[PDB]
Amino acid sequence: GSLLDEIMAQTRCAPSEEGYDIAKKGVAAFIENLMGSQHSAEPVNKSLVDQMLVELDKKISAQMDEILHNSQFQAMESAWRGLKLFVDRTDFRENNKVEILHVTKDELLEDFEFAPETAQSGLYKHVYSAGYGQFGGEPVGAIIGNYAFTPSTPDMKLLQYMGALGAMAHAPFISSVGPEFFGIDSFEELPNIKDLKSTFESPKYTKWRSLRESEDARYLGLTAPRFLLRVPYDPIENPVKSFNYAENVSASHEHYLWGNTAFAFATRLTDSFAKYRWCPNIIGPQSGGAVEDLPVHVFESMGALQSKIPTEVLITDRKEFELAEEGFIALTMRKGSDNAAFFSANSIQKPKVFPNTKEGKEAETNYKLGTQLPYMMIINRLAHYVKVLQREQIGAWKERQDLERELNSWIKQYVADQENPPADVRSRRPLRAARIEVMDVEGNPGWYQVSLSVRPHFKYMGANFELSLVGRL
Amino acid sequence: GEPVGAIIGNYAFTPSTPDMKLLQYMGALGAMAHAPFISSVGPEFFGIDSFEELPNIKDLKSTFESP
Amino acid sequence: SKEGSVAPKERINIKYIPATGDAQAEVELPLKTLVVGDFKGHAEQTPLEERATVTVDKNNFEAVMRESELKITATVKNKLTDDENAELPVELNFKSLADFAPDAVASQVPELKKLIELREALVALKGPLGNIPAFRERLQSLLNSEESREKLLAE
């Protein structure tokens, strides 16, 4: 009973009151590892306890870099902590809600194979009928796709059945393409691509270039590379409770918790709605397309002290403009800080070349405004308000002249027909002019083919700045 | 009635359960009447059982991170 | 994490808000988005037209995560011994956002419950170690008494 004598000589917890069973486990554990190096001195033992903690943390953190960083864990951590980045940023007090649907990506194409028509699918029930197609129910603004799209047939058949779903419920489906979409199989070699226009004119993409020409592709945006979610832990910077955890991140950059940027692009759909109650404001580094507060990880490079880029590539301005013409919502990263920016939210639809007539040169610029997708979101709201507002009216005592007036006096609080209004009148009233022409339907009288023809304001994109010197002036 | 500014505790606190249950019930009392409860810890709070050996403590941060 | 307050009444009830404070806003039908995608670790056997959509805001995110029962069961590499070709399956039950942290992941692995308990036994030693210099006097007695020491290590 000499171990009881060491507790009773230890006057801090001697007479068996509290903590005498824990400290008894402390003495007996240190003696079992003491035989590797015999030494008898307490301050060296205060280092020898610490030398049994550094070797212990090599045993634990090498296991906790393997219980983490797993393909089942990390893909189900980025898909769920990335939701928390969509919940924490969006102000739910400013009239915002978000629905959460558990599907899997292989189940969803089977569910479109399930119904003979997209208007009887199971996803059509949750996008259209449980939301928008419902008396009093709140309608759906956009669909975040937490997916990684390939250019194969089981992913061009899905987007053909999501463009048709997006054209029925007036909500664009935002998701992302993968590394294998560009044909690189490892993502950080994207700026090495020296001609991305010729890559998309390959016969592997026949189900892509036919998707782009389609009419219902207007409601399909496919987003950025990827973005970082979790800073790897550190015993000084971001510690853990009663433990020192240094997450040894290897040269493989797949071990970082890389999220899906359909989360981060819908952050700008909602942080534009929480400020102006509309959403054309998604393409500005200082005007509402700036994904701020990204995680950074300052590590040691080959000699220097650099930072891990929070998006996996540094998208140049020419690479982003070439992605903008080819229908991609790219996220350039502010090199050297924790910010990023969108510059053009163009949907995958292609501007169809119309012949060189007077109307053809006009309608080409008219059809170009459909594809760009901040402008869909100022008329998707003019399909969600007007569906709700003319649902209450069924059964009233109205006229065609009364139908013209309940719409013209309604939308002219969204119209600021003015060449230079202030910066708040432009975004509270995103339209600029609106024409409403109510007609009739003969045969069955009292059915009204009205033609709401809105027109937006125009943002800032590209100039020339052709410098010279004059010498005198 | 004149309100209470502070409570002088003429006590000698141990870190045991009958003295951490009291301070849990004095922090809640101090948050209702807006008056902090001032008292003192004893020698046995630091685990020395005789007080004049307090500067001999060479690491007091690790003493408080004990179970 | 609760401020001690009094019973409310016709008298006035001041409570030091150690907190600072935010603000809120409202609209028409909110801009509702539907986040769709794989959120658990399997494929559910019910067809799509019967399962439901759950509404998440900042206040109920801890309750949506708890009732999902994200149970991640996988076989990972064993790096707790000298074997390279060893594997060790785990069992995870996630109920809060802090369950992703290694304090609660290692607490759900029984092979790591004994290693944090090993460290907690070593942090407990370091306090009373260098204060009393009579500990090394009996380390040499345990160096002398080798028979009675090994009989007590098994206990």
Automatic annotation (TrEMBL), chain B:
Domain of life: Bacteria
Gene designation: tssC
Record's protein name: Type VI secretion protein
Entire protein: shown range: 152 to 218 of 491
From TrEMBL, chain C:
Organism per entry: Vibrio cholerae
Name of the protein in its database record: Type VI secretion system contractile sheath small subunit
Residues of the full protein shown: 21 to 174 of 187
